[PDB]
Structure formats: C-alpha cells, structure tokens
Design an enzyme around this catalytic site. Structure first.
Site, PDB file in Angstrom:
ATOM      1  N   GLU A 258      -5.114   4.004 -10.504  1.00  0.00           N
ATOM      2  CA  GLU A 258      -5.882   2.793 -10.213  1.00  0.00           C
ATOM      3  C   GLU A 258      -7.164   2.710 -11.017  1.00  0.00           C
ATOM      4  O   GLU A 258      -7.653   1.603 -11.269  1.00  0.00           O
ATOM      5  CB  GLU A 258      -6.275   2.715  -8.738  1.00  0.00           C
ATOM      6  CG  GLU A 258      -5.163   2.799  -7.723  1.00  0.00           C
ATOM      7  CD  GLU A 258      -5.728   2.729  -6.311  1.00  0.00           C
ATOM      8  OE1 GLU A 258      -6.071   1.609  -5.869  1.00  0.00           O
ATOM      9  OE2 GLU A 258      -5.845   3.793  -5.663  1.00  0.00           O
TER      10      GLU A 258
ATOM     11  N   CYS B  31       0.837  -1.199   0.000  1.00  0.00           N
ATOM     12  CA  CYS B  31       0.000   0.000   0.000  1.00  0.00           C
ATOM     13  C   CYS B  31       0.872   1.249   0.000  1.00  0.00           C
ATOM     14  O   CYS B  31       1.590   1.507   0.974  1.00  0.00           O
ATOM     15  CB  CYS B  31      -0.942   0.031   1.211  1.00  0.00           C
ATOM     16  SG  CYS B  31      -2.016   1.520   1.277  1.00  0.00           S
TER      17      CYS B  31
ATOM     18  N   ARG C  22       0.063   4.524   2.913  1.00  0.00           N
ATOM     19  CA  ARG C  22       0.096   4.267   4.351  1.00  0.00           C
ATOM     20  C   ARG C  22       0.454   5.469   5.223  1.00  0.00           C
ATOM     21  O   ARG C  22       0.420   5.319   6.451  1.00  0.00           O
ATOM     22  CB  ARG C  22       1.059   3.132   4.648  1.00  0.00           C
ATOM     23  CG  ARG C  22       0.471   1.779   4.342  1.00  0.00           C
ATOM     24  CD  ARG C  22       1.492   0.766   4.681  1.00  0.00           C
ATOM     25  NE  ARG C  22       2.487   0.646   3.603  1.00  0.00           N
ATOM     26  CZ  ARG C  22       3.587  -0.077   3.702  1.00  0.00           C
ATOM     27  NH1 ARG C  22       3.830  -0.699   4.858  1.00  0.00           N
ATOM     28  NH2 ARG C  22       4.437  -0.178   2.655  1.00  0.00           N
TER      29      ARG C  22
ATOM     30  N   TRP D 135      -9.285   6.582  -0.467  1.00  0.00           N
ATOM     31  CA  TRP D 135      -9.582   7.346  -1.662  1.00  0.00           C
ATOM     32  C   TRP D 135      -8.639   6.856  -2.749  1.00  0.00           C
ATOM     33  O   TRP D 135      -7.684   6.128  -2.479  1.00  0.00           O
ATOM     34  CB  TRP D 135      -9.451   8.860  -1.439  1.00  0.00           C
ATOM     35  CG  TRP D 135      -8.170   9.307  -0.848  1.00  0.00           C
ATOM     36  CD1 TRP D 135      -6.986   9.547  -1.509  1.00  0.00           C
ATOM     37  CD2 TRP D 135      -7.928   9.605   0.531  1.00  0.00           C
ATOM     38  NE1 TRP D 135      -6.030   9.959  -0.616  1.00  0.00           N
ATOM     39  CE2 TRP D 135      -6.583  10.009   0.642  1.00  0.00           C
ATOM     40  CE3 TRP D 135      -8.719   9.558   1.685  1.00  0.00           C
ATOM     41  CZ2 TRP D 135      -6.009  10.361   1.857  1.00  0.00           C
ATOM     42  CZ3 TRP D 135      -8.148   9.915   2.900  1.00  0.00           C
ATOM     43  CH2 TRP D 135      -6.801  10.310   2.975  1.00  0.00           C
TER      44      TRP D 135
HETATM   45  C1  HEM Z   1      -6.271   6.545   1.940  1.00  0.00           C
HETATM   46  C2  HEM Z   1      -5.982   6.414   0.630  1.00  0.00           C
HETATM   47  C3  HEM Z   1      -5.308   5.137   0.068  1.00  0.00           C
HETATM   48  C4  HEM Z   1      -4.624   5.120  -1.073  1.00  0.00           C
HETATM   49  C5  HEM Z   1      -4.386   6.352  -1.972  1.00  0.00           C
HETATM   50  C6  HEM Z   1      -4.147   3.775  -1.290  1.00  0.00           C
HETATM   51  C7  HEM Z   1      -3.390   3.343  -2.349  1.00  0.00           C
HETATM   52  C8  HEM Z   1      -3.172   2.017  -2.663  1.00  0.00           C
HETATM   53  C9  HEM Z   1      -2.725   1.531  -3.947  1.00  0.00           C
HETATM   54  C10 HEM Z   1      -2.438   2.456  -5.147  1.00  0.00           C
HETATM   55  C11 HEM Z   1      -2.621   0.192  -3.878  1.00  0.00           C
HETATM   56  C12 HEM Z   1      -2.184  -0.730  -5.036  1.00  0.00           C
HETATM   57  C13 HEM Z   1      -3.361  -0.757  -6.009  1.00  0.00           C
HETATM   58  C14 HEM Z   1      -3.110  -1.730  -7.135  1.00  0.00           C
HETATM   59  O1  HEM Z   1      -1.953  -2.205  -7.291  1.00  0.00           O
HETATM   60  O2  HEM Z   1      -4.087  -2.028  -7.862  1.00  0.00           O
HETATM   61  C15 HEM Z   1      -3.017  -0.219  -2.530  1.00  0.00           C
HETATM   62  C16 HEM Z   1      -3.043  -1.490  -1.997  1.00  0.00           C
HETATM   63  C17 HEM Z   1      -3.463  -1.853  -0.738  1.00  0.00           C
HETATM   64  N1  HEM Z   1      -4.004  -0.999   0.213  1.00  0.00           N
HETATM   65 FE1  HEM Z   1      -3.998   1.021   0.154  1.00  0.00          FE
HETATM   66  N2  HEM Z   1      -4.558   2.977  -0.244  1.00  0.00           N
HETATM   67  C18 HEM Z   1      -5.302   3.789   0.615  1.00  0.00           C
HETATM   68  C19 HEM Z   1      -5.937   3.384   1.772  1.00  0.00           C
HETATM   69  C20 HEM Z   1      -5.925   2.131   2.340  1.00  0.00           C
HETATM   70  C21 HEM Z   1      -6.592   1.700   3.556  1.00  0.00           C
HETATM   71  C22 HEM Z   1      -7.499   2.615   4.430  1.00  0.00           C
HETATM   72  C23 HEM Z   1      -6.293   0.392   3.730  1.00  0.00           C
HETATM   73  C24 HEM Z   1      -6.685  -0.583   4.856  1.00  0.00           C
HETATM   74  C25 HEM Z   1      -7.118  -0.163   6.053  1.00  0.00           C
HETATM   75  C26 HEM Z   1      -5.434  -0.026   2.658  1.00  0.00           C
HETATM   76  C27 HEM Z   1      -4.896  -1.285   2.494  1.00  0.00           C
HETATM   77  C28 HEM Z   1      -4.313  -1.759   1.332  1.00  0.00           C
HETATM   78  C29 HEM Z   1      -3.917  -3.126   1.068  1.00  0.00           C
HETATM   79  C30 HEM Z   1      -4.069  -4.312   2.049  1.00  0.00           C
HETATM   80  C31 HEM Z   1      -3.419  -3.189  -0.170  1.00  0.00           C
HETATM   81  C32 HEM Z   1      -2.846  -4.460  -0.852  1.00  0.00           C
HETATM   82  C33 HEM Z   1      -3.905  -5.390  -1.426  1.00  0.00           C
HETATM   83  C34 HEM Z   1      -3.242  -6.652  -1.929  1.00  0.00           C
HETATM   84  O3  HEM Z   1      -2.107  -6.977  -1.495  1.00  0.00           O
HETATM   85  O4  HEM Z   1      -3.865  -7.351  -2.760  1.00  0.00           O
HETATM   86  N3  HEM Z   1      -5.234   1.059   1.833  1.00  0.00           N
HETATM   87  N4  HEM Z   1      -3.333   0.922  -1.836  1.00  0.00           N
HETATM   88  C1  LIG Z   2      -8.372   1.050   0.632  1.00  0.00           C
HETATM   89  C2  LIG Z   2      -7.797   1.188  -0.767  1.00  0.00           C
HETATM   90  C3  LIG Z   2      -7.679   2.445  -1.371  1.00  0.00           C
HETATM   91  C4  LIG Z   2      -7.155   2.526  -2.665  1.00  0.00           C
HETATM   92  N1  LIG Z   2      -7.021   3.705  -3.335  1.00  0.00           N
HETATM   93  N2  LIG Z   2      -6.779   1.399  -3.297  1.00  0.00           N
HETATM   94  C5  LIG Z   2      -6.868   0.181  -2.740  1.00  0.00           C
HETATM   95  C6  LIG Z   2      -6.447  -0.936  -3.463  1.00  0.00           C
HETATM   96  C7  LIG Z   2      -6.505  -2.205  -2.894  1.00  0.00           C
HETATM   97  C8  LIG Z   2      -6.130  -3.387  -3.717  1.00  0.00           C
HETATM   98  C9  LIG Z   2      -5.452  -3.236  -4.915  1.00  0.00           C
HETATM   99  C10 LIG Z   2      -5.167  -4.350  -5.693  1.00  0.00           C
HETATM  100  C11 LIG Z   2      -5.613  -5.616  -5.315  1.00  0.00           C
HETATM  101  O1  LIG Z   2      -5.362  -6.733  -6.077  1.00  0.00           O
HETATM  102  C12 LIG Z   2      -5.547  -6.733  -7.505  1.00  0.00           C
HETATM  103  C13 LIG Z   2      -5.639  -8.163  -8.017  1.00  0.00           C
HETATM  104  C14 LIG Z   2      -6.824  -6.011  -7.927  1.00  0.00           C
HETATM  105  C15 LIG Z   2      -6.324  -5.768  -4.144  1.00  0.00           C
HETATM  106  C16 LIG Z   2      -6.799  -7.153  -3.746  1.00  0.00           C
HETATM  107  N3  LIG Z   2      -8.264  -7.174  -3.581  1.00  0.00           N
HETATM  108  C17 LIG Z   2      -6.609  -4.649  -3.362  1.00  0.00           C
HETATM  109  C18 LIG Z   2      -7.034  -2.345  -1.613  1.00  0.00           C
HETATM  110  C19 LIG Z   2      -7.459  -1.221  -0.894  1.00  0.00           C
HETATM  111  C20 LIG Z   2      -7.377   0.049  -1.453  1.00  0.00           C
END
Ligand code: HEM
Ligand SMILES: Cc1cc(N)nc2cc(-c3ccc(OC(C)C)c(CN)c3)ccc12
Ligand code: HEM
Ligand SMILES: Cc1cc(N)nc2cc(-c3ccc(OC(C)C)c(CN)c3)ccc12
Ligand SMILES: Cc1cc(N)nc2cc(-c3ccc(OC(C)C)c(CN)c3)ccc12
Ligand SMILES: Cc1cc(N)nc2cc(-c3ccc(OC(C)C)c(CN)c3)ccc12
Ligand SMILES: [Zn+2]
Lengths: 412, 409
Positions: A287, A110, A113, A282
């Site tokens: 994305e 993420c 963070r 957000w």
């Molecule tokens: C507040 C604005 C946030 C932004 C701008 C953001 C941004 C991102 C982005 C760009 C990704 C990768 C997306 C992709 O590769 O398709 C990601 C992944 C992730 N985000 Fe964040 N995020 C935010 C908030 C959060 C929150 C609130 C949580 C959990 C409480 C979170 C948990 C995660 C997790 C667990 C992943 C990885 C999912 C996976 O491994 O499949 N994010 N985030």
């Molecule tokens: C809270 C939040 C905000 C954001 N702005 N972005 C987020 C993107 C993911 C995320 C991105 C990629 C992904 O895996 C790909 C296979 C789609 C997964 C697994 N469900 C989660 C999870 C959470 C997000």
C-alpha cells in the site's frame, strides 16, 4: 437459491455460502452485466428508519444469544418510540461497539479482516466542537500508534441529524503528506494530495513546502465551518526507507508514516449515519505509495530506483519496472521491521485472509470478499487469494463512500 | 442506459452502449457479484438465435434489409424446418469465428481479433482427417517462429451423440507423471490427461518435456492417438541474459499456445472441436511450476541459485525470483525470434483496443479479473482501467471434458 459455492483452484477446497441471503443493497451488477471493477457503481424518514433499526437490533440480540428475549423486545419498543417521537434514535454503547466491529467484518475490500474483533472503539458522540474533535483524534493517534506496536482503533463522532449539522474530517487520512503543484508543472511532495493541500493553504495553513510535510487536520463539528489544527509532531511516527543491500537507497531521502488512518468514509449502523469515523490499523507493505514521489524534476521513484540499479529502461520487456518495484517493496518492509513498526507483507496478509475467510464460511456461513481489491497490487498469482473464488455482497453495518465535504458544505 | 467506465490514471471516460445488445447471462445478480467465479438445442429455439446472428452479419457488411439478407433469412428458416439445423456460409463462419474472439471478455490480446486465419474443417469425418487438419494448422500458425493467429473449425454438434472433440486441452503440451514419492516428472497440470493417454496405448518416454500425443474424437467415436511430427513443434530453451547458471536448469517451453478444449457457438450452432492459437504473453508460460529436483520447484530453485533469504516471506524472495524467471522467458523467445509479448506491451495494446472498440462499436466487454496480468498488476495500465463485463455472441464457451461424458464403444 439458498446455497452458493466457491472453489479454491489451487487446493480444490469448496466452501458453501449462505450468508449472502442477508445481503441488503444492490451491487450494481445484473444478470446481464458485471460491474465488479467499477470504483463506485436529505436524510432518512421515519418509515425508512423503522425497518433498518429493527434489522440491526435483531442482528445484535441474535449475536449475544438473546433473540426474542424480554430485553430484545423492550429495546425494540424503546427504539420504536424514539424514532416515532424524535425521527431518530441513539445506539447503546454495546450496540455502537458491535456495529463498528461488524462494519469492519463486512468490508468486502479489506484483506486485513482476520483482526476484526480486536478493534478498539472510542465513543466520541459527546463531542461538540472542532477543538474537541482534535482532542479525540490526538488520543486516537497516540493510542493506535503505541510507540510502533500498532493497535487498530476507530473514533466515532456524533451521527447525522438533518444533514445540515454533520461532523466531518475533511482529511482523507489523519496523517498524509502535502503536495504542491509548481508553476512549471512538476509536483513536490505527494501528488495524491494536491487538491486538499490547496484547500488547507486557502483556509490559512502556512505550508513548509517540503517533500514530507504532514498535513493539518481540517475538522468540522455540527455543520460549522471546518477549523485547522496541527497534529503534534511527536504523535506522528515515521520510518525512513532504506534497503538491506543497496546502500544507496537511503540517499533517496524517502520516509513514510506508520499509521494508516482513513477518515473520509461514512459508518452506517441500523440506518444511523456516522459521517465522521476515522479508523486505523497497520500497513500492508504494498500500500505504501512512496512509488509516486518525484526524486528530481522528471523521474519518479520507480524510474530513479531502476536508474540506480543500472537496468535497461529502453525496452519494457527487460522488466525493469517489475525489478525496481520488488526492490522498493523489499526496502519498505525492511525499514518498518528494523524500526519495529508493525507492518505485514502481502504473502502473510493474503495467507491470513484465506484462513480468515474459511473460518467465516464455517462459523458465520460466508464472507463477502471483493477479489478485485483483495488481490495485492503485485505478484498476484503467487499469493493464495488469486486462485480463490469469492462472492461479493453488501452486508450492514458497513463503511460507505461519501462525497467530499467541500462539494456540499454551505459556508457560514 | 449508457454506462461510463473511467480510467483512474488518465481520467479518460468511455461511454458504453454495446452492453444493451447482450442477451446471455453473466452469473451476477442485483445482490451478489460473482466476477471471480470461473464458470458461473431444439428446432424451436434455433431460428431466433440464427436470425439474430444473420441480422448482425448483414448489419456488419452494411447490407441490412437487403435482398440477400432477406433471402438468407428465408433460406435459414426453411433449412431449420426441413433438417432441424442449418449450415453457415463460409463468409458467416469467418465472421462468426472472428467475433467470438472479438467478444472474449477474458482475452487481453483482442486488438488482433480481425487478423484471424479461419480454416474450415467442416467436411472432416474421421480422426485421421482431424490429425491432418491439425498438423496443417500447427505448421501454418508456427510459421518458423513468426506466429500467426489461426482457428480450425470441425463439424458442429448434431444430436450430441456424435461430437467432434480434441481431448487435449492444448494442441501442444508436456506430459506429467506421478512419481513414486509424490513429486512430479514434467508438467503437473497434465497428470490426469497423460494417464489417459497411457491407458489408451501411448508409450510414455517418461521425460521432463515429453510432447503429448493428440487424442482425437470424430463423429462421437472412441478417440484415437496421433504423434505430432516433431519438426512441427517449435521449442525455446530458457536461458537468462545475466545468470549464466539459468541454462543449467534445463528448462524449455513450446512456442505455440493452441487451446483446443473450448466450444465455439455461432448463431445457435455449437462447434465442439475448434482449436485456436495465437502467441504467448510471457507471464502465461507455466515453467514456474516444474520441479528441478525432488522437492523444490523452479521458483524455489531459482531463488536458491540467486542466493536469496528464503526463510522469511517479507524478504520477498518469491517476488524477486518470479521477475527473473519472466525476464528469462522473454529474453529466450526474443533471442530465437519466436513471437512473444510482455505484459506491459500487451496491456498497453488492450487499452488502445478498448479505445478503438468504444469509438467504433460502442463498447468492449472486459473481465478485469482476467485481463490484469498475474504479476505487477498495478504498474500495468489495465489495473486502473474500469471495465464492464457482459456476454455477447458469437462466443467461446467452456465445455465438459470428454472423458466425463463419453460412452466407450
Ligand atoms: C489491521 C490491519 C489492516 C490491514 C493490513 C488492512 C488492509 C487493507 C488493504 C490492503 C486494503 C486495500 C488497500 C488499497 O486497495 O489501497 C484495505 C481496505 C479497506 N479496509 Fe482494511 N486493513 C486493516 C485494518 C482495517 C480496519 C481497522 C478497518 C475498519 C475498521 C478497515 C477497513 C477497510 C475498508 C472499509 C477498506 C475498503 C475501502 C474502500 O472500499 O474504499 N481495515 N484494507
Ligand atoms: C484501516 C486501514 C488499514 C490499511 N492498511 N489500509 C487501509 C486502506 C483503506 C482504503 C484503501 C483504498 C481506498 O480507496 C482508494 C481510492 C485509495 C480507500 C478509500 N478511502 C481506503 C482503508 C483503511 C485501511
Ligand atoms: C494473438 C495473441 C493472443 C494473446 C497474446 C492472448 C492472450 C491471452 C491471455 C494472456 C489470456 C488469459 C490467460 C490466462 O488466464 O492464463 C487469454 C484468454 C483467452 N483468449 Fe486470448 N490471446 C491471444 C489470441 C487469442 C485468439 C487468437 C483467440 C481465439 C480466436 C483467443 C481466445 C481467448 C479466450 C476465449 C480466452 C478466455 C478463455 C476462458 O474464458 O477461459 N485469444 N488470452
Ligand atoms: C479497478 C481497481 C482495482 C483495485 N484493486 N484498485 C483500484 C483503485 C482505483 C483508484 C481510484 C482512485 C484513486 O484515487 C483518487 C482519484 C480517489 C486511486 C488512488 N490513486 C485508485 C481504481 C481502480 C481500482
Ligand atoms: C489463443 C490464446 C493465446 C494465448 N496467448 N493464450 C491463450 C489462453 C487461453 C486460455 C487461458 C486460460 C484458460 O482457462 C484457465 C482456467 C486454465 C483457458 C480455457 N480453459 C484458455 C486461451 C487461448 C489463448
Ligand atoms: C479468480 C481467477 C482469476 C484469474 N485471473 N485466473 C484464475 C485462474 C484459475 C485457474 C483455475 C484452474 C486451473 O487449472 C485447470 C483445472 C483448468 C488454472 C490453471 N492451472 C487456473 C482460477 C481462478 C482465477
Ligand atoms: Zn458482478
């Protein structure tokens, strides 16, 4: 050894990681193989649960600077008797809040963070039915959306017990658009969501069969069959996509929803498993997957945009795909900004993450970070994360993948 | 066990068995992945390594266990006994050099690995001879713009006190000078090495595209300076097919990428001077980091001439000017008939290369962090391609810069 060093090759800044010593479970990599680009490389017993709970409670009492206190020792004894007699235990409200924030803080993939401590935690562990899950999810969506001034939030439903009573959100996100495969092979709507769309229709959903049909919630409480609910459309904030210079861009008829809210992941805290825990923030502009939509019966948006830009699409070395992708991402950011819906571009998000990562190395002793997922899907090298070395490791509390519920659910 | 890799766009699943043959470490552990970290011989140890390589060589020509295989093993064993080292046959040198390229997990260009011209320079004894060998390499590889892959291999390390070294990082690079204020005339990447050349007696023309002199070290001696004959240095003026003002930026680049500071290891032997060259992928050409005036780099100046909004980052002006610069580079090389490949074509070729390698070799070590191009990553086919990274030998290795190890005489 105790210390691991990472270097930023643009700034020469060197950071020393000691937090990796608290890493818990394997990465999949060995000393002879790296699986860094691999997508992903019956319940806990009593004796399995005792050390996982103790490690989480120790970590919690260390964080509030009460380690070894009377309350720490008493909490540990309480948890131990509870596992000893009920084979599980219940987190206090403070520990639940602490654990959810730290699962976000520990999410290596993420980029967002820096905001981890501002997460709004909604405790839904008293929920018993799918209607109650719908109530909780509607309130979450309403709160997180906040009329476009988006606020990060998570709603946590009851933890897993024996594995046959799970709470699950069958949706991959709370708000997504339906996709419909036609007999002629083409796709209408979002191609990512065709399988789940078919599941909903099968469960009784009457599909509008448009390009941007918000999918219904499919909610499972206490291991019962999932139930369909329509989100009230006034709760779903959407942005039409237009371009600041290309007056024709609006004629594509594209829009997107404001609130990214991922709902198919599992939250693990102290060996307890919260299989329903939708969380939202957000968007980062890159994305928004409006790229994959079909404008007509053959070309997707990237092709249709380049065609209207009058680019040469016969040679790849004209870089027409790169040129069109930039303009699409310009339009996305312009439209969200013009409508005052929170969004962050990839230059801002990655600059924040570096600042965040440096603060974490100094204040926490490290920051697990997955370069393969942190670097944005475009313009990678002109963002500060590209030249930043990272260390990836798995800390708990954590968000984890889980199999889709339709593969495991025993229909009643 | 066998490991699967999945392409998440095509759903193609490849099964990897080759990783079971790797013996060198990657840097990762069970608990920490270090895939984004850039850099994670005695007589007694030499023969096992040599036998390992000799074994795979005779396995490659389908003569494993043959008479010649056994006699060669016997020969290499005695030769290590009597001399503490051994010499590769010409056939083995060529095989080794090609497979070092075949095994370079960070190289997207490996579909071409078996079309490598190997120049044996193991008889070299002086820096003048190194200069000769290197000039012949440059002339052959340039080939009037129809570039051909080549490597030149100088004598292997002996006691470590006699290394052959090319002090340049590439055979052809532009000088970069420290300016009175703090900006940079020429290439900022080469300031340190430029200063080394000036200290060594080079007279700097102090221009924007001054081809650096060769700094060549033979047999552990002090290195010596040489001017590459300018007719051997093919260059390309950068212009844009739409923006007539782009040529007014005055930029150019050289046609031949020839990396010269890496170390080649074959069967336990170390070749510390082994410059190898191919042709460019457009995104590599670092003309972006130059300075047009006294404060703005090419990216800022390009966006300025494009009349973009440079106040907010969300206008994505950097991304827009980046693509145009890359269009100009590709247009310019193609217009002068100098070999170049775009990142779309090259990553397409690499996915096809992986398919070939899994089919015929059981796998292909690949470093996603480096294979994915530095722009437009997800719209190239390698983004969604899972890869397994592992270290096979023969290999190219990093080595310290010589000025940090050399005791001047
Ligand atoms: C507040 C604005 C946030 C932004 C701008 C953001 C941004 C991102 C982005 C760009 C990704 C990768 C997306 C992709 O590769 O398709 C990601 C992944 C992730 N985000 Fe964040 N995020 C935010 C908030 C959060 C929150 C609130 C949580 C959990 C409480 C979170 C948990 C995660 C997790 C667990 C992943 C990885 C999912 C996976 O491994 O499949 N994010 N985030
Ligand atoms: C809270 C939040 C905000 C954001 N702005 N972005 C987020 C993107 C993911 C995320 C991105 C990629 C992904 O895996 C790909 C296979 C789609 C997964 C697994 N469900 C989660 C999870 C959470 C997000
Ligand atoms: C023939 C056309 C070739 C193309 C288009 C090509 C392309 C590339 C690119 C784009 C990179 C990464 C560059 C970067 O990160 O800036 C790379 C890395 C590399 N290439 Fe190739 N290459 C070619 C030929 C060769 C040849 C002939 C050799 C050696 C015999 C070779 C050996 C390597 C090695 C060893 C690396 C990684 C160096 C390291 O570990 O840092 N390449 N290649
Ligand atoms: C190597 C890599 C890096 C990255 N940074 N991201 C990646 C995302 C996917 C991926 C996997 C599945 C998937 O979709 C469903 C099949 C779950 C999607 C979305 N199309 C993306 C696959 C590989 C990725
Ligand atoms: C033969 C060839 C052709 C090409 N078209 N490109 C090439 C790029 C490299 C390369 C790129 C980066 C790099 O290291 C970075 C840290 C600067 C090194 C070793 N230092 C070698 C090496 C060889 C190349
Ligand atoms: C994580 C990562 C991925 C990648 N794909 N590439 C990377 C290239 C560099 C890098 C480091 C040093 C350097 O310069 C010299 C000191 C060798 C240059 C070229 N300016 C690039 C550093 C990190 C990289
Ligand atoms: Zn790894």
């Amino acid at each position: 050894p105790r210390f691991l060093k990472v270097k930023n090759w643009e700034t020469e800044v060197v950071l020393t990681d000691t937090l990796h010593l608290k890493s818990t479970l394997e990465t999949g990599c060995t000393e002879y193989i790296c699986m860094g680009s691999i997508m992903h490389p019956d319940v806990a017993t009593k004796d399995q649960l005792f050390p996982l709970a103790k490690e989480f409670i120790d970590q919690y009492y260390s964080s509030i600077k009460r380690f070894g206190s009377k309350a720490h020792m008493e909490r540990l004894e309480e948890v131990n008797k509870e596992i000893d007699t009920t084979s599980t235990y219940q987190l206090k409200d403070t520990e639940l809040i602490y654990g959810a924030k730290h699962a976000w803080r520990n999410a290596s993939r993420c980029v967002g963070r820096i905001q981890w401590s501002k997460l709004q935690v909604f405790d839904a562990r008293d929920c018993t039915t799918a209607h109650g899950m719908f109530n909780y999810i509607c309130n979450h969506v309403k709160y997180a959306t906040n009329k476009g001034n988006l606020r990060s939030a998570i709603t946590i439903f009851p933890q897993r017990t024996d594995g046959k009573h799970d709470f699950r959100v069958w949706n991959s996100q709370l708000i997504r658009y339906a996709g419909y495969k036609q007999p002629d092979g083409s796709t209408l709507g979002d191609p990512a969501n065709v399988q789940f769309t078919e599941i909903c229709i099968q469960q009784g959903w009457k599909p509008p069969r448009g390009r941007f049909d918000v999918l219904p919630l499919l909610l499972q409480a206490n291991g019962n069959d999932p139930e369909l609910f329509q989100i009230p459309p006034e709760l779903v904030l959407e942005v039409p996509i237009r371009h600041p210079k290309f007056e024709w861009f609006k004629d594509l008829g594209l829009k997107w929803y404001g609130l990214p809210a991922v709902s198919n992941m599992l939250l693990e805290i102290g060996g307890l498993e919260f299989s329903a825990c939708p969380f939202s923030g957000w968007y980062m502009g890159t994305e928004i997957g409006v790229r994959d939509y079909c404008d007509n019966s053959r070309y997707n948006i990237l092709e249709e945009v380049a065609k209207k830009m009058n680019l040469d699409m016969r040679k790849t070395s004209s870089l027409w795909k790169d040129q069109a992708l930039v303009e699409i991402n310009i339009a996305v950011l312009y439209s969200f900004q013009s409508d005052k819906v929170t969004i962050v571009d990839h230059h801002s998000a990655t600059e924040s993450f570096i600042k965040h990562m440096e603060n974490e190395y100094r204040c926490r002793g490290g920051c697990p970070a997955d370069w393969v997922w942190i670097v944005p899907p475009m313009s990678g090298s002109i963002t500060p994360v590209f030249h930043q070395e990272m260390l990836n490791y798995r800390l708990t509390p954590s968000f984890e993948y889980q199999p889709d519920p339709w593969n495991t659910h025993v229909w009643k």
